[PDB]
Amino acid sequence: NMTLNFGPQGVLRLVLELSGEMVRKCDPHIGLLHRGTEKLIEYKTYLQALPYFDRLDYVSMMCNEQAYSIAVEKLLNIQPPPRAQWIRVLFGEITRILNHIMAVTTHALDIGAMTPFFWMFEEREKMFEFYERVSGARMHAAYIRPGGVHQDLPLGLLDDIYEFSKNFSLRIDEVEEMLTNNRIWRNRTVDIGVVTAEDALNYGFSGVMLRGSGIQWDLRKTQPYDVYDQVEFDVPIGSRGDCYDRYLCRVEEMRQSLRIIEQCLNKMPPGEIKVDDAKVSPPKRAEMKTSMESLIHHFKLYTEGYQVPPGATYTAIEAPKGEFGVYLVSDGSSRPYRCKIKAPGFAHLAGLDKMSKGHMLADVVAIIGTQDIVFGEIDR
Amino acid sequence: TSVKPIFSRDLNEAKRRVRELYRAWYREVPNTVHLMQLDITVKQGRDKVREMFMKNAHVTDPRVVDLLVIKGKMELQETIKVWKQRTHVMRFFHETETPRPKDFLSKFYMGHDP
Amino acid sequence: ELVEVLKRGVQQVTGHGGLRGLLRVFFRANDIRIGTLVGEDKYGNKYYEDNKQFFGRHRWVIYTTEMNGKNTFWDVDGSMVPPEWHRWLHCMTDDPPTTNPPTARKFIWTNHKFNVSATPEQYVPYSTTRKKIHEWVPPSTPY
Amino acid sequence: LHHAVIPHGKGGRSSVSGVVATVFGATGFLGRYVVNHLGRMGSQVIIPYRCDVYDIMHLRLMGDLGQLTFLEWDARDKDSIRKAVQHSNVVINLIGREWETRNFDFEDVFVNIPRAIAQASKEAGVERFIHVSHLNASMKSSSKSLRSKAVGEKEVRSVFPEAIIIRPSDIFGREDRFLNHFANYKTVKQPVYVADVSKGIVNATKDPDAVGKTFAFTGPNRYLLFHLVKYIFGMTTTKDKVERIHISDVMPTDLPGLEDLGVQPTPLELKSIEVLRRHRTTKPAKTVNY
Amino acid sequence: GVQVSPSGEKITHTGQVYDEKDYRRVRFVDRQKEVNENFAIDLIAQQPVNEVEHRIIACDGGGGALGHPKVYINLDKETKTGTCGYCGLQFKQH
Amino acid sequence: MMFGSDRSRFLEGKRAVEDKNIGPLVKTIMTRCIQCTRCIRFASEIAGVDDLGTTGRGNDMQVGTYIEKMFMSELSGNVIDICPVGALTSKPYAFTARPWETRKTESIDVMDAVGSNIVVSTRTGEVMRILPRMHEDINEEWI
Amino acid sequence: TYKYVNKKEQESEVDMKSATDNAARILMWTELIRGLGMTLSYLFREPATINYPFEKGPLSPRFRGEHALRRYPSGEERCIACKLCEAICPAQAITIEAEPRADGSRRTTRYDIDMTKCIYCGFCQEACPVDAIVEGPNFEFSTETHEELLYNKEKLLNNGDKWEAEIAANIQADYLYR
Amino acid sequence: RPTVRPRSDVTHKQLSAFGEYVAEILPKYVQQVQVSCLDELEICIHPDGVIPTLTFLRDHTNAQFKSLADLTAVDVPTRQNRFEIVYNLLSLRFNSRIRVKTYADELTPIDSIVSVHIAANWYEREVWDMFGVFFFNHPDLRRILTDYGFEGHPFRKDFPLTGYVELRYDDEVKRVVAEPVELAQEFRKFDLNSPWEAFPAYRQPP
Amino acid sequence: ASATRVIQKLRNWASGQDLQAKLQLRYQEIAKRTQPPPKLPVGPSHKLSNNYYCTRDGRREVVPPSIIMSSQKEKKAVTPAPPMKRWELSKDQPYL
Amino acid sequence: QLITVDEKLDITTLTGVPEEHIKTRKVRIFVPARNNMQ
Amino acid sequence: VKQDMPPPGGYGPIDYKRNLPRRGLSGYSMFAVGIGALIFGYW
């Protein structure tokens, strides 16, 4: 039936059974990026395992650290302080912006429009600069940890973030001019990968793939976890469930992120940054080098880390790609017994076959882009 | 003691499922050396199938047999549909490694292999 | 406002050691800008500055033509920048050595070495721990 | 024995085999297998090269980390051979051309260079030296290559009495100058496989009953040149090359053969299919004895 | 200080040298052996003994932080000095 | 970590103690003694020595011998396992490893004919130390 | 609070005016000339490019690059062989082996790092209670063999001696945040 | 307090009431209902109640547990039925979450629920590939994350971390061959668990 | 900022916006490298009295699951929670 | 619907573990001794 | 004596909506321009 294998030669392998130019069967293949994160974590303390989440869904990395942090804090029965919560929200929204830039621009790239990629990855560089100024790493900042945050913000960061938020709007508009009303974009996207709300639900979708079909589900307005309950923002919903609606949703999300960042900056509180419970979060170095108890706690935390009372949780985060979850099982030990990661790309790929019904070979490459398929969160 | 079964009631039905699976394999084998340009001969391939079947002959449990049938069917799928490759199929013969000699002396002389 | 641009350009051209220096610069560093010389390091490199350019091009360096016995007229590496100037060139600071000098400590390298990934003076690893199990040696005379 | 040599391991890439081998002739066609067989069991391998570093990159992945040491040399340059033979227990020589250049005659290649190699080996204090030659090595030979080979074997034995000469026949594999030479376009042949030859050499590298001896590595079967070339064409410029072609293979009598190292012949009727499918766009050959 | 062995190899700050009969010397051929020429065991000896008018003295290495944990040393044994287990410095009671 | 707090309210000066020398096997850093008397009692009762004791009173008090005596018994070496802290340590094992590195096998002695149950703690394939193992019908925590 | 994207507040008008406007949009290719104009505007701006080896990208005093083993002003080492770095290193990249030195001190005989295992996370310099191991600023240390990235006490001490004039300053900058 | 987590009892009440609700509707297929300190509701059941219970929770008007947030397995090799199976479910009409657990072993499969939730089509394949647990009435069930010739179930507790085989390219045969595993640095097993009890509330009796 | 009025007007007309106020290249508006030194606060548990861990441990305030309907040990119909309240269209911008 | 299979249980052919590591081995079941240090 | 990087009295206001301008002219005028050019050319 003109079968073919497409995608490789960047870890995707589709097996496509066509009928002429139409697409009849899409069989994705998985495990080309399966490393064994969920098993390795079982041989590592609750802190030796955090980087793995920065490495999962590697375009945000901090909405990933955040889920693990919230889960371990839910187990420990502690809560981080206001300043940490606000920093964490701010940077989660920044990661949202990064992810949505990534998605829109790689979509337009795999379709053929390539200049937004270069116009926006400069902003991505300018935000990696924040990542580095706060953590020392551009992408994989092991910066958000159970108990709050590692370090405080240097003295010239909020001003820079304000200068950036000033102009990101004009940049989004620069891109929208080219893309949103272009008849060719509308022809490539409109009425593509349509999906109804009930089938989405029963397939296990989350995020833009839900609220582009008229559903109202955002895990920040519902089941909030951080101070998000103290900040205002709108949730854009769609009407037809197509790539164009999802594009517009992601754009308006990039805008609500600026709306949230203005508030986070203006309302940043003072105080500590990590729970002052030195049996969970290490003490400062001066206290470590002058006080006995603080040094003992440092030693134990960095050799045999904090112990977590047994239990189980499922903490969901409204990540840029949807509900990111962690089923975390604990024995009364320094290390976990099981950590299962729920990623949306999983169900999205699962539903790709139905979403590619009555469509050509050149519409599948856009159906994929509309899911923001990263294979780290999938293959794990 | 008493159990709950899987895809069989007794080793007879289990063995006839096994024989159907062997029919399928035996028949398909040459198409593989044709599609993917393997060096080996169909005789070698068929001897290998026989060896991999008799490797699990002592088995008695209908359930332990049904599961092996399931897994062999998975492999046959992966093979008839060209998802495996020359590499995955030649990973059965071990063309690039010497075996642990089955001799107390050949073991003693080199290592602590017991 | 175009003739002023042309004037800025002609001064950018003639702002070097005539045609020879202009060619040298334009062909090693594909750039003919004019900036202020904040300093020069032991190895012959120069470091220029201009605060009206944008962030990332407001500081730069002209490497030496020779470094520890090597014709660096064409071959050039960011590994040539010693630490004190590395820290000002990657904009960790607003202050260069001349005004903010480092801490004079022995056991600090006086001569900087660049990357040696393949040179004959490169790095070869090994174990630093002595022999653990000492064997038995019998005497050199029988019975 | 030095503890750095005790063969600790399980016979694998990341193991130790106690074999420190300086190998000359690795950039070629048989070294490409000798080095693999040496390294995939955990041996240290010094490789001198004269080529450019690009032509020696197919060998960096056939041995574990740190076991391969690539250094440079020049046959005419002595004191570039001490570097390589020193720090070794075994030396292997595989050099040889199928033609003559300006700087290097058959005399040089097969007599003068191996002699210096063995001299430097003895000077250093190594314990094994392996030299490879042709099966038809003989002073009475239309080809002067074989003349030089049979001279160089003696010139070697005169400095390394306990050496090990190995006379295989026309070798066939991938990137070989025999089947590809035939398919580019009175005499019986018994060819042999690089895999078998390399296994034999790497086994002799340890086997204790191989010193001061010779070995004739020949296949299991024999064929008439015409039947063999027709088999080639069915499955599908040098004077000395054509001379070595138009010579039949000896049946060496009672000489320690291939099955005395432990190896077993691999018939050409099994690897021709993999060697020849590249030259595309059948029944076997009747094995005979004269 | 680096002092060479018969084979011609430099010795390290922990007395490591490939025995002249060792095959592992190959890796250094056409190359070098990376060795540090500044031996702490000597650079600290080059330092003088501090003197104090108190039988107990606290050491941190310098800056409060940037040093090491504050440790207290006794100076009742005029026979020898009081050494710090972190920095190596040594004190006396006068 | 379990039953104690997480910070100090002690903003005063600590104390320091003169370190003894009581043999080639036992290293003494006596500013870590928490005055528990396990060593004194072990010696007086099991080893029948009566040469350890407490000289002084108050915080100025400390443990050991009033003189430079050496503590060399057939049982000297269990004070190491019994001292809850690192005031008494083993000079051989000094600085060679840390507990979380060791792999622990359970074996027996051959030095004598008693068969004392023992633990051998290795690291990367080397034997690092030897410990007792409770067998209340043979050795009962001693070796 | 929610919003609508791709939904009109109400039906439109089929007036000749709006129909002709849409027909002009279609025929005259109006919505595309605006994209052409955006590209022209970008052509007439200044690019964000930089001469790399001469102009370097900006970093922070917290950057985590190449490793270094530090010393005290006296010149004495700092590592006391406490193994917290080896115990926290997620990738199990630090191998340590210590002994008592002839001067009776806790110092290492072996300290190896594998840069093909380090994920560059900084936990080792977060744990070091003496500020002896630091993930320095350097990032330009690529190689041609996999055997030049297996570091050791000597290489790391040389890197420390090399980069201390910068590591010390960056630590002076940032040590009040940690 | 500023370092401890707040504690709302309304959710505990609601979820205990719903536990009683569910358990008295399905006295069969039900056992070990429990709501925890952190206000999460688990319902343990018999392997014969999977589809009944999932359908009830999805369709029942009071429940509307539509979204299958996750499907998981968990290996506890000290109990005869060693493979715990976990369904994490979400309802939007109530803004609620629930956990439904069952048990299994080797040779004792579970019933598939692609009829109920189609998301499971891949989660169940993943469970079969990782923990070795068969499902009845699954259209396609095959290796999804592992290689094609992989023989084993690696997310168990007895399967070694580094595995049993290892891959590399060999010039002789010009392929990526598999071989036994020979590492140049054996993974180090750090024994960390402390001898001193940290949580008495979970102290088992002797 | 180093461009002539003609080019500025050309680009502004081609884009429709004003760029010389929302540029993406940074010209001295940014924070100053080499900032002064900070002095961070201290948490609330840095007291010297009334700071016992028994009151503020947390991870020991946990308790095992409160089990119900263990198989070995006319009510109304309830929901796992009161039904979700639907959302309100925004006021700033409810469309596009 | 129930069957009776009283023979000993074995899953060796499903574990995927090989012969070398399933017959050439010796396992130990115990309680780890207390560290006399603590 | 303390300093931990908070914001001052307040940051400026920010724009997060669209500003896509209404450009061009009317279809009637565009068609008239084109047709006038066309008729001039024909004549």
Ligand SMILES: CCCCCCCCCCCCCCCCCC(=O)OC[C@H](COP(=O)([O-])OCC[N+](C)(C)C)OC(=O)CCCCCCCCCCCCCCCCC
């Ligand atoms: C290195 C130096 C290179 C220098 C290159 C210089 C190139 C100069 C070329 C001219 C530049 C034009 C760029 C576009 C400027 C942006 C215009 C804009 O924003 O408004 C658009 C506006 C935007 O409209 P709008 O969508 O925002 O709103 C109006 C919508 N309607 C009309 C439906 C109500 O659209 C127009 O008005 C289009 C006007 C032109 C229509 C006629 C073009 C089609 C007919 C072609 C005739 C034949 C070709 C004629 C040309 C011959 C020579 C090639």
Ligand SMILES: CCCCCCCCCCCCCCCCCC(=O)OC[C@H](COP(=O)(O)OCCN)OC(=O)CCCCCCCCCCCCCCCCC
């Ligand atoms: C005397 C009175 C009467 C006289 C008779 C004549 C009267 C005038 C008649 C009017 C003539 C109209 C102009 C003729 C061409 C029109 C072609 C056209 O309209 O194409 C339609 C097509 C889109 O169609 P559709 O998909 O249905 O629209 C979306 C529906 N919502 O659009 C397209 O797909 C076009 C795709 C374009 C993609 C590339 C665009 C590049 C543009 C670069 C600029 C080119 C400018 C011209 C260059 C000139 C060359 C020198």
Ligand SMILES: NC(=O)C1=CN([C@@H]2O[C@H](COP(=O)(O)OP(=O)(O)OC[C@H]3O[C@@H](n4cnc5c(N)ncnc54)[C@H](OP(=O)(O)O)[C@@H]3O)[C@@H](O)[C@H]2O)C=CC1
């Ligand atoms: N195949 C056959 O027909 C038979 C072959 N043999 C023996 O097999 C051995 C190898 O065969 P083959 O692998 O085909 O040889 P190759 O020609 O494939 O490569 C042999 C090596 O010899 C080296 N070499 C040749 N001449 C010189 C020189 N003048 N100076 C330095 N190095 C030189 C080359 O190094 P570089 O590539 O770097 O130049 C080359 O790598 C030969 O010694 C031959 O006697 C024996 C019997 C039968």
Ligand code: SF4
């Ligand atoms: S056993 Fe140790 S802590 Fe106890 S009194 Fe003796 S030296 Fe002090």
Ligand code: SF4
């Ligand atoms: S920075 Fe590298 S070496 Fe240091 S702890 Fe992290 S992974 Fe290990």
Ligand code: SF4
């Ligand atoms: S943490 Fe620091 S002092 Fe301790 S072993 Fe590591 S480098 Fe040495």
Ligand SMILES: [Zn+2]
């Ligand atoms: Zn000190």
